[PDB]
């Protein structure tokens, strides 16, 4: 059994930062790229970036480079997404997903339930 | 950046109906090194995260019903549902999993 556990809803003031957690259960994240995806209310999916917990190698979508920081803690088997200088535009549901590395190729097969971040106008 | 264009934007469906949805990429998603198309299809229901359906354009993820068939290559992809079931009401998204940044289409919403 494999799953990704995401932190609770966050109500945050503009200008502040927030760190979301994604705890894996059933597998060790050192064997998976950990991804973050954003989805605004009534909108589509936006890839934010990913990290390779084994060596901390990261890759971000250009538009999120200045907004998000993805980190991992293999000891607690948890991946994180930190959003800086929050604005109302950051209001959305943030999903984490994994890509296992034992298969020559595997898609983003396991996703967390998502964490909603709300930043008032 | 690869733009993914899905059509139709929405579709009113009935039980047992056969439906097809299209997903076109602005650049080929075919990896010449292994001849596999890096196109993934997801199903997302209200209040739930995307659920993997098919990857590499036509490979069904274990557990996914046979009524879901993915096809196409290069820049033209299709998701077909042989016979719509009530549990299929949701938004279907295709995703460029070929090169960075990973991108998604705007989806096709199956509505009652």
């Amino acid at each position: 059994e494999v799953q990704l556990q995401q932190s609770g809803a966050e109500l945050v003031r503009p200008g502040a930062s927030v760190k979301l957690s994604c705890t894996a259960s059933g597998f060790n994240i050192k064997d998976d790229f950990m991804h973050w995806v954003k989805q605004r209310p009534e909108q589509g999916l936006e890839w934010i970036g990913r990290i390779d917990p084994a060596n901390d190698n990261t890759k971000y979508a250009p538009k999120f480079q200045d907004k998000a920081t993805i980190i991992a803690d293999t000891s607690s088997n948890t991946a994180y997404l930190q959003l800086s200088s929050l604005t109302s535009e950051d209001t959305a549901v943030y999903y984490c997903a994994r890509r296992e590395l034992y298969s020559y190729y595997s898609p983003l097969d396991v996703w967390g339930a998502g964490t909603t971040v709300t930043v008032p106008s | 950046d690869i733009v993914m264009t899905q059509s139709p934007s929405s579709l009113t469906v009935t039980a047992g109906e056969k439906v097809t949805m299209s997903c076109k990429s602005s650049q080929s998603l075919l990896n010449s090194g292994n001849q596999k198309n890096y196109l993934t299809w997801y199903q997302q229901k209200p209040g739930q995260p995307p659920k993997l359906l098919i990857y590499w354009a036509s490979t069904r993820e274990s557990g996914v019903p046979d009524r879901f068939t993915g096809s196409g290559s290069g820049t033209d992809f299709t998701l077909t549902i042989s016979s719509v079931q009530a549990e299929d009401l949701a938004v279907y998204y295709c995703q460029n999993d070929y090169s960075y940044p990973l991108t998604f289409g705007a989806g096709t919403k199956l509505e009652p």
């Binding site: 590395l101 | 990896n31 890096y38 990973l102």
Partner: peptide
């Protein structure tokens, strides 16, 4: 290319 990133990761490159 994504596959190349996966390959390099597993190859220690």
């Amino acid at each position: 290319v994504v596959q190349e990133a996966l390959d390099k990761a597993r190859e220690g490159r």
